[model samples]
Target: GPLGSHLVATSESVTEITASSFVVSWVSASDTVSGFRVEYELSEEGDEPQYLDLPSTATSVNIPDLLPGRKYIVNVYQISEDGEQSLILSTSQTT
Candidate 1:
């Protein structure tokens, strides 16, 4: 038997969704993944999509520039040697 496929690096959950800022935490996929990133977009038309580049050194990151009392979508992604990859965790936040 041969073992080849590795676990994909991904985010587990979002936390500390305060007024203008929140948190994202991802799990380390050991040797399978390399870099990390967080992307966000406002549910309304007032703002454009935003992205943040993250290295593997940090365990978590706090994102900002969100408006209060509005809905938004935040996503976390991982990069590898072959290409780029991503994980999805959709949630509603009114802050």
Candidate 2:
């Protein structure tokens, strides 16, 4: 069985928006997760997504190397101990 039934991102926020980066923070519904997979992409119609992985203890991450003054779509996923991914928690930012 998947842990998706028990885990979820409760809330999300984007902070410290700059010319080329921004910080993202999220709260999880449960502490049983192993890590997180962060996905992001330019808000442009044809852009590709990028990913980053972080530990379970991490509630925030700084995304960098982005184009100046652009909007981006970001999503966070909880990675369970069994290596299964739960549903995505999404947000957006301009940097």
Candidate 3:
């Protein structure tokens, strides 16, 4: 069976904030998910989203080269080996 959304990754903290970027730190059990993904974008439309995936061993990602602005939307998901994923965390950062 696919894992519940609650089994997905969760943001533990946000750090190293700056005009151009910030750091996202998160944690989830390695055995629960096969991979990790992060999607982030500005609140409004027009700007392309930032997206990427990583091995389950990863715990943090750097969102860089972003335009200095307000309310960046971020979502973290954990995927199973079968390519199923459920979002368990949502966050926003203000510049």
Cα lDDT of candidate 3 equals: 0.75
Tens digits of per-residue lDDT, candidate 2, 1-95, equal 66665445433344444547778778764488899989989897548889899998877788888887788998988888899887557888777
- Residues 69-93, candidate 1, lDDT per residue (tens digit)? 7777777777666656767344545
Q: Rate the local accuracy (lDDT) of all candidates.
A: 0.65, 0.78, 0.75
Judge candidate 2 against the unseen true structure and give its global Cα lDDT, from 0 to 1. Answer: 0.78
Screening candidate 2 with a backbone cut-off below 3 angstroms (N, C-alpha, C), the clashing residue pairs are: 69-95
Q: Candidate 3 on 37-78: residue-level lDDT in tens?
A: 999988866478878897877777888776776668888887
Q: Name the TM-score of candidate 1.
A: 0.65
Ranking by TM-score: 2, 3, 1
Instruction: Show where candidate 2 strays beyond 4 Å.
Output: 1-19
In model 1, which runs have C-alpha deviations exceeding 4 angstroms? Answer: 1-19
lDDT-better candidate, 1 vs 3: 3
The candidate 1 region of ten consecutive residues with least summed lDDT is 1-10
RMSD of each: 8.9, 9.1, 8.5
Clashes of each: 2, 1, 0
Inter-residue clash pairs, candidate 3: none
As for model 1, its CA RMSD to the true structure in angstroms is 8.9
